[PDB]
């Protein structure tokens, strides 16, 4: 069935629903094994109740957000890196939304995606964001290909490839998290790709956080990284090294191929110098621009 229903920002979509007797379910069969989404009742178990709705018209733009960016990240996944689901072979996509009371965050547990609705002040619904949502799913992503380790900078690396494909999902600007974060300032948001240290991130490996919390930093040195996918991307001069842009269609292409097929569960920075030297050499050729750039954005954010 196509129910439709407004998103956290108040913007009326449609997506896929499953009739089921007297009503419907937030369930598309179509997608893999399904993408299913839950509320989990302003309670903590998970994944709770599908939630369900008499005339697919949906009111709840938590869940709205949730089922139909998850159905549009396996879209995004399938079109662009011809991959199935999260496991390559169609996993189903389970949410929930409505996770606790007043909840400020989100989060992959090795099975779904949970999202609180945020406090009001600052947060809302974490589901708002295409890019959060991204973020999340795109952590499962990783546990099924180099299953990097969420500490120190493996863990920072974890993270840094949950923002690069977020981020590009959506494609809107170099942020993350804007949706969601402080509804009442405008432009601001968790994170910056292009400047993080506007949100206290690192964005040079000589700034490297070095202390135990965190998972020692790993939602702090992550800056790092996004500045050289950004660097690759958008191209720039930054520590005296001038990076030529190859764009994002190219970036997100080197990026997923390193981050997949290259890197594993304990790689740091260095090997992800390489493991993204490697990928644009396999798509561009050995001495091509896009292998000088992606070697050229590691220089710049002093990964050697
Ligand atoms: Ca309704
Ligand atoms: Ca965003
Ligand atoms: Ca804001
Ligand atoms: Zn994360």
């Given at each position: 069935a196509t129910g439709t229903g407004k998103g956290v920002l108040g913007d009326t979509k449609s997506f896929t629903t499953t009739a089921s007797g007297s009503s419907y379910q937030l369930k598309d069969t179509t997608r893999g094994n399904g993408v299913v989404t839950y509320t989990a009742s302003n309670r903590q178990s998970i994944p709770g109740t599908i939630l369900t709705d008499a005339d697919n018209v949906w009111n709840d733009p938590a869940g709205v957000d949730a089922h139909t960016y998850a159905a549009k990240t396996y879209d995004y996944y399938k079109a662009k890196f011809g991959r199935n689901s999260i496991d390559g072979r169609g996993l189903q996509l389970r949410s929930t939304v409505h996770y606790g009371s007043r909840y400020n965050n989100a989060f992959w547990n090795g099975s779904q995606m949970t999202y609180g609705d945020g406090d009001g002040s600052?947060?809302?619904?974490?589901?708002?964001?295409?890019?959060?949502?991204?973020?999340?799913?795109?952590?499962?992503?990783?546990?099924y290909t180099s299953n990097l380790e969420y500490y120190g900078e493996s863990g920072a690396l974890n993270e840094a490839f949950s923002d690069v494909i977020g981020n590009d999902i959506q494609r809107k600007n170099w942020l993350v998290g804007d949706d969601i974060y402080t509804p009442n300032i405008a432009g601001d948001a968790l994170r910056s790709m292009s400047n993080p240290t506007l949100y206290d991130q690192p964005d040079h490996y000589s700034n490297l956080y070095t202390g135990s919390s965190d998972n020692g930093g790993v939602h702090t040195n992550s800056g790092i990284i996004?500045?050289?996918?950004?660097?690759?991307?958008?191209?720039?001069?930054?520590?005296?090294?001038?990076?030529?842009?190859?764009?994002?269609?190219?970036?997100?292409?080197?990026?997923?191929?390193?981050?997949?097929?290259?890197?594993?569960?304990?790689?740091?920075?260095?090997n992800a110098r390489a493991a993204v030297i490697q990928a644009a050499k396999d798509q561009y050729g050995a001495n091509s621009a896009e292998a000088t750039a992606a070697a050229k954005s590691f220089d710049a954010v002093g990964v050697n």
């Amino acid at each position: 069935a196509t129910g439709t229903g407004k998103g956290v920002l108040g913007d009326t979509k449609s997506f896929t629903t499953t009739a089921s007797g007297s009503s419907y379910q937030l369930k598309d069969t179509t997608r893999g094994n399904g993408v299913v989404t839950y509320t989990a009742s302003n309670r903590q178990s998970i994944p709770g109740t599908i939630l369900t709705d008499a005339d697919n018209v949906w009111n709840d733009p938590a869940g709205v957000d949730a089922h139909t960016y998850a159905a549009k990240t396996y879209d995004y996944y399938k079109a662009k890196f011809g991959r199935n689901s999260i496991d390559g072979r169609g996993l189903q996509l389970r949410s929930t939304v409505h996770y606790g009371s007043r909840y400020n965050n989100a989060f992959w547990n090795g099975s779904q995606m949970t999202y609180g609705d945020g406090d009001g002040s600052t947060f809302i619904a974490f589901s708002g964001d295409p890019d959060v949502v991204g973020h999340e799913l795109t952590h499962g992503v990783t546990e099924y290909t180099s299953n990097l380790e969420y500490y120190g900078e493996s863990g920072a690396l974890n993270e840094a490839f949950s923002d690069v494909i977020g981020n590009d999902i959506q494609r809107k600007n170099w942020l993350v998290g804007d949706d969601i974060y402080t509804p009442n300032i405008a432009g601001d948001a968790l994170r910056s790709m292009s400047n993080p240290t506007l949100y206290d991130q690192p964005d040079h490996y000589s700034n490297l956080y070095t202390g135990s919390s965190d998972n020692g930093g790993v939602h702090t040195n992550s800056g790092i990284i996004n500045k050289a996918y950004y660097l690759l991307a958008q191209g720039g001069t930054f520590h005296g090294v001038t990076v030529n842009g190859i764009g994002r269609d190219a970036a997100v292409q080197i990026y997923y191929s390193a981050f997949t097929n290259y890197l594993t569960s304990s790689s740091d920075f260095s090997n992800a110098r390489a493991a993204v030297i490697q990928a644009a050499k396999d798509q561009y050729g050995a001495n091509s621009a896009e292998a000088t750039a992606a070697a050229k954005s590691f220089d710049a954010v002093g990964v050697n």
